Structure formats: structure tokens, C-alpha cells
Design a protein around this ligand. Structure first.
Ligand SMILES: [Mg+2]
Ligand SMILES: [Mg+2]
Ligand SMILES: [Mg+2]
Ligand SMILES: [Mg+2]
Ligand SMILES: [Mg+2]
Ligand SMILES: [Mg+2]
Ligand SMILES: [Mg+2]
Ligand SMILES: [Mg+2]
Ligand SMILES: [Mg+2]
Ligand SMILES: [Mg+2]
Ligand SMILES: [Mg+2]
Ligand SMILES: [Mg+2]
Ligand SMILES: [Mg+2]
Ligand SMILES: [Mg+2]
Ligand SMILES: [Mg+2]
Ligand SMILES: [Mg+2]
Ligand SMILES: [Mg+2]
Ligand SMILES: [Mg+2]
Ligand SMILES: [Mg+2]
Lengths: 158, 256, 171, 138
RNA sequence: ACCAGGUUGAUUCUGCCUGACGUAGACGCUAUUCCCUAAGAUUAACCCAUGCAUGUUUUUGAUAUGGAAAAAUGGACUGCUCAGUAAUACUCACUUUAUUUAAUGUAUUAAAGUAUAACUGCGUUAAAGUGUAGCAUAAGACUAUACAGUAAGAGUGAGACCUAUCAGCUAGUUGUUAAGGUAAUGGCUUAACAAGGCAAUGACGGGUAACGGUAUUACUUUGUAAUAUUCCGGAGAAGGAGCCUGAGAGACGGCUACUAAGUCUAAGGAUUGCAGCAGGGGCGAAACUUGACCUAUGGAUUUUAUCUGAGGCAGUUAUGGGAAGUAAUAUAUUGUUUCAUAUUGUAAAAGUAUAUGAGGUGAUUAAUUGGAGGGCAAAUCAAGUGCCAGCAGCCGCGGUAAUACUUG
């Protein structure tokens, strides 16, 4: 269906290329699975020689880590704020790797810092994903603190 | 070719199997095992060609199913079992024991040994690291794992396997001035005294005081000293005289 | 073609010379050969060692005087075209290859079992030997041979007799 | 162009000069596949249409007997020369023949003009044997 | 380690044609043995009637003393062909900390409930196949990893036919950031931005009557030419595309659709891929038995009794290479093949070898093919025909005495 071969592309000089064999099963691809937000759902895959893969169609209640106090706690996922490569994913609410989100601060026990205090009055905090959702099958990430919060907030919608 | 190969051809067979390149077309492709592809031979050729105990395929099953064949102290009934380097095979009947290493002309030989040598076995360490729950381990060439050994045994030193309790008993370290045995390369079956150890090769001395250089992976030290001699040597002792002296013994030496 | 089906000898370069057919016909009638073809086989291997005798005189290797040249002198000596020499001495090895260039075709053609019967008292003519061998009346020490062009080696020379149980003898 | 490091200029120059070889030029263009008269083979087959004679060139004087046929493999018309005395009396029309060449590299030899082929078989009977009288024609 | 004939009234040169000699296919005439070795590659990767080539196994035991089904295991190897590909395929030297591996070896760990078959019994259609019951009824199914060992994938660099009447070419093309996907590196795919990348040391085009190396043949003074043929490697199963099971298939003696060709029928429907072994048709100048068998070497997870058109053993053919015959001693003597028979041998039959029998012949059962002016070894021998009929690779003979045509 979808191949990853290299025999079809042009040469370094720009001349055309010619094929001599059919499509092999060794280089075999799949379509994109866009992980949405909703009620949870996980389907299984079969890879080469056993080795089962997990893909997540609709994800909820991802895990996150507090960097200062060094504890890990679960939270809900509300909205997406920024996506690096394509800016259309923010209106469709798809979660991929390295895309910042907005999480509930209910179970989280935060320390007293100047920056997080004003958002902690409301329910929301910020986090950034660090795991492949479509292949591992679950999201994990870090909570934004310090100058890392200064970098992303210049890129927000405003 | 979408998968593995299962048929082997007699012309690409190794010449060290001493087969005839006559009327046959196919040869036995042996099983996967602990030894490499070069140092292994099938078992069904040993009972037919080198040892002479059977004539055809029927008499092979008779000796094997009677459970007298004992390789490394274990009974085996499969004809495709690979016999490697250095292992001791024996028959339970008649108390016959053999050690397997190469001759002088790159061929397999079988040398009758004693029951005091029939117990143990020699191998060479290749790798060592500490496994789970803080337990040390030492890995040999054939793939056996061994734990809780002496800390004076290094990565390249040889061991002595008891073969019945499967415990490391004795070891010989790696240094200069040791007797050595080689098993691969263009020079096989040479027995030599170490003179200089380089980082990748070893500069050695034959019993006929010659010289040859050989990589470190292809050798196995059998004794630290000449007086040690942990195993029994072959009859030629691996001297492998040159073609000049083979031309000298036929017609006499050139008088000058 | 294939190795089992290639040919060994070709036709000569000039097909009709009056100065070549007269020389060769003296050899056919004297030694008793049936074909011009079978004469051509015994001369090519006579050419091949002379192709190798020239190289060993010009070799600069120190071991080539010891090994291959001594491995040249023996093979003629076992068949017995050469008589005998001491292989330990160096200077006679030089004399052995120098004696090789003085041979002819007749030095090879004389050590054949057809001619070697007639040169002994067993046969009257050389044509008496070709008619005698093919019926199976002549035997070497153990073996009964039916090929008149069999080369006779040096040590097996004196042991040619009649077949003891044939009709050529009394039994 | 004589130099130690001039192998690139030597090979490029000597390939140009080799093209004026008159035997090598036909090998490049492949004329034996394009303009072959009989195809690529030792013999051929045909159907006879005429029995006619020609007259040889000066200074000799005779009449050479030939035959105009039509090949099967290609479909062209061609003339061949009957090679022995009194052999045309066997030949009738609406019959088959086999054709062999002269052996002078595609040219005409002798004093026969413009003809380069000769008949060998008629009705699977050898014409060399039939002139000797070993067989009879059906 | 070698040259000869041909331009002129005669001579010396340049220059080409021809003779003498190899390697693969076809053809004419003639043939007694034995052993070894080969046979639809060249045109048509064109169409196929018929018969046969992939099944094993107490794991349970068919109302059944040994076989029904279900489970388990292999059908991806082996064998056949050379259409496509001028380099990505192949060879050699390196990397894979950037990757997967059933069957193997040594070690670490963990441990009551729930279907469907075979069976019994009612049926259906021209055929090919299929249905409803007996709360129907069995065996089965609901541990995880290391390190070796085999197998495979993916990269870097260098080598390889003819063409200038083919001189400019390239736009996912070259690079940066980010993500998806794969077992994995990577414009492999997609967003955003930028203008890069290659060439007379031949880019970009066109042709091939082009599968690459190699074992092996020739000819040689630093090396050329052939290599379908032995072995290693790659690609395809009428032409194209897509996918299931699975450790491994983009599989074709597995499935789905379209195009080109069809076949059976009770007219509603059902169905086929011999570049597998024999065999037929077409094409051609051109290529064999619709034969017996698991003896030996092997494969199928222990292969001593299962299967094996893989692989052996025999029949047809001037495909070639060997050991030999058709006489010898003086009409006569002796005695080789064409004839038969024992033993050895064969899976069972041949054949070879050792021995034994008779009969009497080398005008015999047992020699042909080409040539006789020069090159070029061998007749101015005879009889016919007269620029006719004919011969001649080149030079050249034929006009009533031809060593140059026809016969002896
Ligand atoms: Mg010719
Ligand atoms: Mg074909
Ligand atoms: Mg079943
Ligand atoms: Mg072809
Ligand atoms: Mg082609
Ligand atoms: Mg039922
Ligand atoms: Mg784009
Ligand atoms: Mg080739
Ligand atoms: Mg076809
Ligand atoms: Mg296949
Ligand atoms: Mg395929
Ligand atoms: Mg397919
Ligand atoms: Mg088929
Ligand atoms: Mg066939
Ligand atoms: Mg033929
Ligand atoms: Mg004659
Ligand atoms: Mg003369
Ligand atoms: Mg002629
Ligand atoms: Mg003549």
C-alpha cells in the first residue's frame, strides 16, 4: 500500500530513473493515526515477527511529572495551545509529540512560585508531551517551569 | 528467495570434511549449535568415514538409538548434531574416548585419550560483565554462562570445565612465554611459544624455532609453561615442515 | 568445448611438403605405427618438457634449482629415458637439464611395449609384436596387457615374459 | 599525445581512428541484421517459379542455367544457380528447393553476374548424389 | 617465434583480393566393437489433449483393534527459463551503539468455568457444492527475558559495450527546522522557509540481434577473445494491480478485480494457467522414451519401512574425446571379430570382466571420402564433344592430337 523504498526518486544529477522489480513486503507502511481527546480507546497492532504495537485513537488522563518536587500524578487534558509543524492541529485537537497542552490542577500539589500562582487560582496548568502517542500508546510529559515557560508563551495565540 | 536455504552442495562443501567430490550431489547441512560454521562437522560423517563403524544409513540408527554415544557426557540420538572443536566424545561400551582437534594438514582428526583426561574440557573466555542483582558472570566461546568465579580471571584467559558438575575448576592466565594452539587462519594446527604480544596479533615461535604472526582471536593458550602441558599433544606436535624439507627428505640434502 | 571433450592435437601447418613426409615415413615403417594421428600424440609431450626445460635454466630463485628441477629429472628416470644421476650433487642437476635438450622422438618411441618385445628375442619382426599382443599371449610379471603402446618403466624392464598358461607356451 | 598521465586523451583519440576500418564499421551499424538477403542461417527453402538461363561475361562464352525462387522465411524473390550438368531435367515447377551460398563473403564469384546462391536439394533428394546416379527422383 | 599466387614488353615499390590454420551451429556420402561425455538456448517469455510430480505423525482414538475427523508440523526450500534491467543488479574492501529471527546450545524467571468436529437422523440441485435438528457429544485453547549460533534487511566508496547527425540539464529537484510511519538510518511522506544540485575527467538523451561474475578453453613476449554449458548471485510464472495466514510470501501445483484468449450445461449457473517430467501443435536450416525405481547422495523438527518425474538406472541419436580391429610367419600353417553358455553382478533385468563351447573364412561378415595445370603431394594415359555441354576460392582451360569438361 504505502512503501518506503528509494528506487523511484531521481538521481543526484537530475536524470530519470527506471525500476526493475515489483513491490516488496520488507518496506511496508501504514496511514497516520491522529490521537484525539475524548473517551479512552486503544487498539493493538501486529508488527514483523510478533512484537505487538499499541496505537491510541482517543486519549484521556495522561501522566505528567512535577520537576521541582519530583512526584508524578495524573491529570485531565483540556485544550492544546501550540503545535510546531502544522498550525491546523489546534482547531482539530490532535495530540502528537512535543505539543503543549492545558491540564487540570486538582490533584496536583504545587509549591509557592510567582509564575504558577495566578493560574493555580483557576483550574489550569501547562504541560508538554514527550512520548510518541501513536506507537507507545500513552502520553507522558513535564510541567512547564521557569524560563521554559518564557519561551513557549511568546508563541501563543494572544 | 523469500526465506532460508535448506539444501547444501557438495562442491561448496568444506575440504576439511575429507569428502569425495565424486558421484554425490548434495551434502548434509548441519544444525545450528554452539560452535561456528567452520569448526563444526556433522555426526553422521564421523561414524561413517573417520571412524569405521557403519556402512549405510540403517546401521547409523542402530548405534545411535542404542544410546552408547556420549558427547560431552550427554547421550544424543540425532544424526545432524554438530561436533565442534575440543569436545570429548565417548562410547559407554568399550571405554573408548577421543579428543577432537585438527591435524597438521587442515583436516579433522580423532586422538584416543585416557580416562583421567576424559573428565575435563578446555575453553576460552571472550566477555565478562555483572548481571542482574549484582552477580558476576563470565561468557565463554561456546555460549555457556558461569558465575561466582575467581576475580583473577580476565577477558582473554582460558578455563578448565569439569564437564560433570559444570563448574569452573582451574584457569590459565594470558601472558608471554606460554605454549599456544591455533585453530583458524591460513596456519592451522601450529603449536608455539609466545615471544611478543601485540595489540591485535601475537609474535610466536615454533618448536622448530620458526616465526609466524596470527591474530589473537584465532589462538587458544593451552598452558602457561612448557612443563605444564595441560592436554596431550598430537603425534606430529603441529610442526608442519616446509616444502623445501619435504624436497630434502625425498632425494637427500644438497651436498655443497 | 568441455574439459572431457576438448581435442589434444591439430593438423600440421603446411599440409603438403615433400621434405616433411619423407622424414616421417621413415619413422612409421621402422617402429610399426598404424595412424599418422598416434604419432602426433607422442611428440607433443616431447615438446612440453622442452618448454619447461628452458625456464629452469633462467630461474633466479634459490629454491627452484632444488625443488621443481629435481622434480623434473625423476619423472623421466622412472620411465627410464634418462639413465641415472646423483641428485645430491648440484652441478649434475645442471647437466641433467642440459642432457634433456639432446633427446629425440625416438628416445620416447623406443620404450613402448610393442617395440620392447621385438628388441628382445620374443618377436621376430615389429609386426610380429602387434599381432601377438592383441590376442593376449604376452604378460608382464603379474599383469596381462592388451595395449601395445603401453609405456614400460625402468624397473619393470627385465620382467617381461610370455604368458605361462597361454597356447603360445606348451600349456 | 605521448605522456605518462595521458591515458584519458589516448583512449578517446584511438576510438575515433578505429572507425575507419571497413570491417569494423559494419559491425557498429549492424548491417547483417538490417540488410541481409537470406536471413541469418546456412540454408533456406523456397518455391520455384521460372527456369531461365543467363549469359556469362567476356571473354568466356556459355549459357548458365538458373532458377528464380521465392523464400519462405522472409518472403522475397531471389535467383539461384543450378550447379551441375544435366541436373535441370529433374526440376519441375511448383516444387521446393534448398539454397546454399558460394563462400566469397556475400559476393559473386566466377563469371556468373549478380548471382550469389546455388541449389543443393530438390524434394529432399541430394543433387550431388542424384548426378552420381545413386537415387531416383519420385 | 615460418609465408605463398595475382597490375608490366621486362624491373623496383605502395596497396588490396585470394590460398594455407582455429571455435561454435546446420548439411551431403559411408560406418564393426567397448568405456567416458552431451541433446528445443538462437526464431515464438507462442497456444496446449492426456497421465503424473506435497504430504507425514498414538496427540487424542471413529457405536468400528486400528482408522475417522480435529489438533500439530512443512508446503517461502528444491526444480525450469533469461523477457526486463548499462546500474540501485554483480564483485571486492569497510559499517550497522541504526535492526528483526520459529526449529538449536547454555542459563534466569512463573504457574473451577467456556465452543466446534467426526457420529445419528431429515433433505437439496444438470453439474460444481452446500442446509435444518439431537440444551448434541470429544482431545485443544483461554509465562516473560538474556548471551551465543544460523538466516535476512539497510548503508559508504571503487570498477565495467557502441553513439556529438545527442551541449546544457534538473523543480520533491538540493538544503534547514518540525512531525507522521517503519523492526530500523534516510525527501521515505507532509507543513513552513530558502535557492540550491550536476556537467567536454562527456551531464542530459538514443541503440543493444545486453542477466552479471566464475570454474574452464584458445592465442600470446608486459596481455587479448569467447564463457546459454560446472558453481555462486539477481528477476519472472498470459499482462498489470491489491491482499489474508505466517518467524519468513507483495507467494502464483494460495485468494480478489480488470484486459487478451477460451471450455462444460438440462440454459438458472460453474470453471483453466506444462518458462515442473513425459507428449502433441505452430515456427524454423535446426534438437530424444505419453519408459522402470527408492539401490547410492539428500530434503521434510529423532528419517533403521512413509512420500520424493529432486535424484539414480536403462532406451533413441555420426555432439565430441580415448583403448583398439580388418592379419602374421614362411598354396599351406596357426589363430582375432559376426554365434552361444556358466559364474560374478543388478531393487529386479542389461552390460563389463574370468572361464568354457562349437563351425572355418581376409577376393571376406569385416573401408570409405576427396583430389591429379600452378599455389599444392599425384598422369602431356586412353576413348568421346568441339567457345557447345560444362569446370573453376584467385590465376585461368574448351575453335576435330584437351595431362584443365563427360566416362573408363
Ligand atoms: Mg573457404
Ligand atoms: Mg524459447
Ligand atoms: Mg484436518
Ligand atoms: Mg534471448
Ligand atoms: Mg533480451
Ligand atoms: Mg452442529
Ligand atoms: Mg511541501
Ligand atoms: Mg557471461
Ligand atoms: Mg506460455
Ligand atoms: Mg516459488
Ligand atoms: Mg516470486
Ligand atoms: Mg503474483
Ligand atoms: Mg504449472
Ligand atoms: Mg515439458
Ligand atoms: Mg542436432
Ligand atoms: Mg574414387
Ligand atoms: Mg608436384
Ligand atoms: Mg573450389
Ligand atoms: Mg584442378
Amino acid at each position: 500500500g504505502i512503501n518506503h523504498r528509494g528506487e523511484h526518486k531521481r538521481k543526484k544529477s537530475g536524470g530519470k530513473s527506471v525500476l526493475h522489480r515489483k513491490k516488496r513486503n520488507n518496506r511496508r507502511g501504514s496511514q497516520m493515526a491522529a490521537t484525539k481527546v475524548g473517551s479512552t480507546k486503544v487498539v493493538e497492532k501486529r508488527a514483523r515477527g510478533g512484537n505487538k504495537k499499541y496505537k491510541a485513537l482517543r486519549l484521556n488522563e495522561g501522566e505528567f511529572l512535577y520537576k521541582s518536587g519530583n512526584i508524578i500524578n495524573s491529570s485531565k487534558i483540556i485544550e492544546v495551545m501550540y503545535h510546531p509543524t502544522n498550525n491546523d492541529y489546534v482547531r482539530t485537537n490532535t495530540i502528537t509529540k512535543s505539543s503543549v497542552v492545558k491540564i487540570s490542577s486538582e490533584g496536583i500539589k504545587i509549591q509557592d512560585e510567582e509564575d504558577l500562582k495566578e493560574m493555580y487560582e483557576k483550574g489550569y496548568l501547562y504541560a508538554v508531551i514527550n512520548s510518541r502517542p501513536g506507537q507507545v500508546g500513552k502520553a507522558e510529559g513535564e510541567i512547564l517551569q521557569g524560563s521554559k515557560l518564557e519561551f513557549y508563551t511568546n508563541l501563543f495565540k494572544k | 528467495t523469500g526465506g532460508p536455504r535448506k539444501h547444501l552442495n557438495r562442491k561448496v562443501a568444506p575440504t576439511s570434511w575429507k569428502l569425495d567430490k565424486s558421484i554425490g550431489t548434495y551434502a548434509i547441512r548441519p544444525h545450528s549449535g554452539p560452535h561456528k560454521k567452520d569448526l563444526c562437522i556433522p555426526l553422521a560423517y564421523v561414524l561413517e568415514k573417520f571412524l569405521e563403524y557403519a556402512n549405510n544409513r540403517k546401521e547409523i540408527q542402530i548405534i545411535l538409538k542404542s544410546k552408547n554415544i556420549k558427547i560431552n557426557g550427554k547421550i544424543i540420538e540425532k544424526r545432524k548434531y554438530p561436533v565442534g572443536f575440543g569436545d570429548v566424545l565417548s562410547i559407554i561400551k568399550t571405554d573408548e574416548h577421543y579428543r577432537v582437534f585438527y591435524g597438521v594438514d587442515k583436516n579433522f582428526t580423532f586422538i584416543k585419550i585416557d580416562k583421567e583426561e576424559a573428565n575435563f574440557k578446555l575453553a576460552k573466555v571472550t566477555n565478562k560483565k555483572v548481571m542482574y542483582e549484582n552477580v558476576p558472570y563470565i561468557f565463554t566461546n561456546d555460549g555457556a554462562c558461569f558465575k561466582y568465579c575467581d576475580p583473577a580471571i580476565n577477558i582473554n584467559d582460558t578455563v578448565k570445565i569439569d564437564l560433570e558438575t559444570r563448574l569452573v575448576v582451574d584457569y590459565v592466565s594470558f601472558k608471554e612465554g606460554d605454549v599456544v594452539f591455533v585453530m583458524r587462519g591460513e596456519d592451522t594446527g601450529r603449536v608455539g611459544i609466545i615471544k611478543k604480544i601485540q595489540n591485535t596479533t601475537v609474535i610466536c615461535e615454533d618448536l622448530s624455532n620458526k616465526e609466524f604472526e596470527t591474530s589473537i582471536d584465532s589462538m587458544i593458550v593451552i598452558g602457561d609453561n612448557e612443563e605444564s602441558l595441560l592436554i596431550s599433544l598430537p603425534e606430529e606436535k603441529g610442526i608442519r615442515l616446509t616444502a623445501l624439507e619435504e624436497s630434502n627428505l625425498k632425494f637427500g640434502e644438497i651436498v655443497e | 568445448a568441455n574439459q572431457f571433450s576438448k581435442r589434444l592435437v591439430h593438423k600440421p601447418r603446411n599440409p603438403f611438403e615433400k621434405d616433411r613426409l619423407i622424414k616421417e615415413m621413415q619413422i612409421v615403417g621402422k617402429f610399426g605405427l598404424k595412424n599418422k594421428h598416434e604419432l602426433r600424440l607422442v611428440e607433443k609431450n616431447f615438446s612440453n618438457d622442452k618448454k619447461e626445460a628452458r625456464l629452469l635454466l633462467t630461474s633466479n630463485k634459490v629454491e627452484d634449482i632444488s625443488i621443481n628441477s629435481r622434480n623434473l629429472l625423476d619423472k623421466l628416470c622412472t620411465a627410464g629415458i634418462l639413465n641415472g644421476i646423483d641428485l645430491t650433487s648440484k652441478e649434475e642437476i645442471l647437466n641433467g637439464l642440459n642432457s634433456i635438450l639432446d633427446l629425440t622422438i625416438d628416445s620416447y618411441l623406443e620404450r613402448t611395449l610393442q617395440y620392447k618385445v621385438y628388441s628382445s628375442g620374443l618377436a621376430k619382426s615389429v609386426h610380429h609384436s602387434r599381432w601377438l599382443i592383441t590376442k593376449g599371449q604376452i604378460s608382464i610379471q603379474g599383469v596381462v596387457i592388451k595395449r601395445p603402446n603401453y609405456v614400460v618403466k625402468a624397473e619393470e624392464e627385465a620382467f617381461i615374459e610370455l604368458t605361462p598358461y597361454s597356447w603360445s607356451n606348451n600349456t | 599525445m605521448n605522456g605518462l598521465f595521458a591515458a584519458n586523451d589516448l583512449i578517446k583519440s584511438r576510438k575515433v581512428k578505429r572507425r575507419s576500418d571497413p570491417y569494423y564499421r559494419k559491425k557498429i551499424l549492424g548491417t547483417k541484421y538490417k540488410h541481409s538477403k537470406i536471413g541469418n542461417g546456412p540454408q533456406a527453402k523456397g518455391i520455384v517459379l521460372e527456369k531461365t538461363g543467363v549469359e556469362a561475361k567476356q571473354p568466356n562464352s556459355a549459357v548458365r542455367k538458373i532458377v528464380k525462387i521465392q523464400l519462405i522465411k522472409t518472403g522475397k524473390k531471389i535467383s539461384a544457380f543450378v550447379p551441375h550438368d544435366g541436373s535441370l531435367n529433374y526440376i519441375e515447377l511448383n516444387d521446393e528447393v534448398v539454397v546454399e551460398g558460394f563462400g566469397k563473403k556475400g559476393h559473386s564469384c566466377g563469371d556468373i553476374p549478380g548471382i550469389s546462391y546455388k541449389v543443393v536439394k530438390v524434394q529432399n533428394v541430394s543433387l550431388l548424389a542424384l548426378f552420381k546416379g545413386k537415387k531416383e527422383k519420385p
